[PDB]
Amino acid sequence: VDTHKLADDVLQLLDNRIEDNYRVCVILVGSPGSGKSTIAEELCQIINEKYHTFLSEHPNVIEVNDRLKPMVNLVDSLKTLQPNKVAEMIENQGLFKDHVEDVNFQPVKYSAEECTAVVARGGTANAIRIAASINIAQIVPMDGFHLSRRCLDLFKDPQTAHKRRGSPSTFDSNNFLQLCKILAKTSLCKVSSTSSVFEKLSKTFSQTIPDIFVPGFNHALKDPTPDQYCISKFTRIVILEGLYLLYDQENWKKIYKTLADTGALLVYKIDIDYEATEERVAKRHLQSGLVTTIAEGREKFRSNDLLNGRDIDNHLIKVDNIVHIRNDH
């Protein structure tokens, strides 16, 4: 795939929506070993580099508006987890024992300078945090929303929960959807002769947009970790990458519509070279210790539809705006 061309398409949408959307979202889906992580980082970088180069010759172009307007309230629609329940949750290792598999459990907020935490069925481990050199593009990995291993222990059937970790049901889909709702709201708010997209965005940064912190995934501790990615008023391009952003089930299905409805969404789906991906994933499992030989790794890939991508392709939401891209090496 041509990442510079993706960068060009992203800037074109942003420019076209400059007056209607504070930020454009990009959805990038790929099965394990598809390389969505590197494509997203590369795209993100390219865009930021372009902006820095623009700033080089337009040194003082940046201005933050809406200084006399109130902050965009992102959590007003959520129920507040009363102080007593916050304590109970914290006491139970930051978990909600009776809702770990409840996809309909609604996210709740509470005050943790001040700072608002939004949690759902995964508890504190997948919390989104909202606050009271200049990069305009940021990535949002879905990995940070993996339910914690301790959360998986509370599943009615922990054994399968762990063995199948990485399946759609082992992520806090509730809170990821909530993150998307927050992003859409920060996009649909109300914005504000040149033709330069960078010039336009530089004069329209808004003081009303708070910093938003999202969890990341610590591959060493095999669990999610807090505030690894910050989306601020300067972030005008959000690149969400993951396995189930286009999955037609439960909360995942609502993701596309939630971001699509902003009118500022680009969607990409990576089509994998089977053999190359099989080898890649087989080697990863070997290096991680999951298998003793590459042959075992390959068979695991072939028989696990969560690994070979079949599950994702079978559950790909039916929308005509999904741009299929290749990442062959």
Asked if 31 and 243 touch (Cβ cutoff 8 Å), the reply is yes
Any idea where the domains of the chain sit in the sequence?
1-329
222: left (phi over 0), alpha (psi -120 to 50) or beta: left
Residue 128, beta-bridge partner list: 118
Separation CA 6–CA 12 (nearest Å): 10
**Helix segments in the chain, DSSP class H:** 3-16, 36-57, 83-91, 149-153, 158-163, 173-187, 197-202, 250-260, 274-288, 294-303, 310-314
Separation CA 20–CA 263 (nearest Å): 8
Domain 1-329, CATH class in plain words = alpha beta
Determined by X-ray
Annotated binding-site ranges = 30-38
Both tokens of residue 299? 């068979």
Separation CA 257–CA 127 (nearest Å): 22
**3-state class (DSSP) for residue 228:** strand
Separation CA 230–CA 215 (nearest Å): 9
Which residues, 6 or more positions from 132, have their beta carbon under 8 angstroms from its beta carbon? 71, 113, 114, 115, 210
Phi, psi of 195 (to 5 degrees): -125, -10
H or E stretch covering 179: helix 173-187
Both tokens of residue 169? 């049901």
Looking at residue 109, its amino acid is K
Separation CA 133–CA 51 (nearest Å): 11
Phi, psi of 307 (to 5 degrees): -95, -40
Annotated binding-site ranges for ATP = 30-38
* Maximal C-alpha separation, the chain: 63
Asked if 235 and 211 touch (Cβ cutoff 8 Å), the reply is no
Residue 108, beta-bridge partner list: 79, 119
Neighbours of 219 (CB within 10 A): 10
Both tokens of residue 329? 């090496």
Separation CA 325–CA 47 (nearest Å): 19
Separation CA 127–CA 212 (nearest Å): 11
Asked if 242 and 166 touch (Cβ cutoff 8 Å), the reply is no
47: left (phi over 0), alpha (psi -120 to 50) or beta: alpha
Neighbours of 320 (CB within 10 A): 4
Q: What is the DSSP string of 279-323?
A: HHHHHHHHHHTS-SSHHHHHHHHHH-TTTSSHHHHHTB---TTEE
List C-alpha distances in Å: 119 to 57, 109, 129, 135, 316: 43, 6, 9, 27, 27
Separation CA 113–CA 134 (nearest Å): 23
Q: What is the DSSP letter of 157?
A: S
Q: CA angle 292-297-300, nearest 5°?
A: 125
Asked if 55 and 61 touch (Cβ cutoff 8 Å), the reply is yes
Cα 164 to its chain centre, rounded Å, is 21
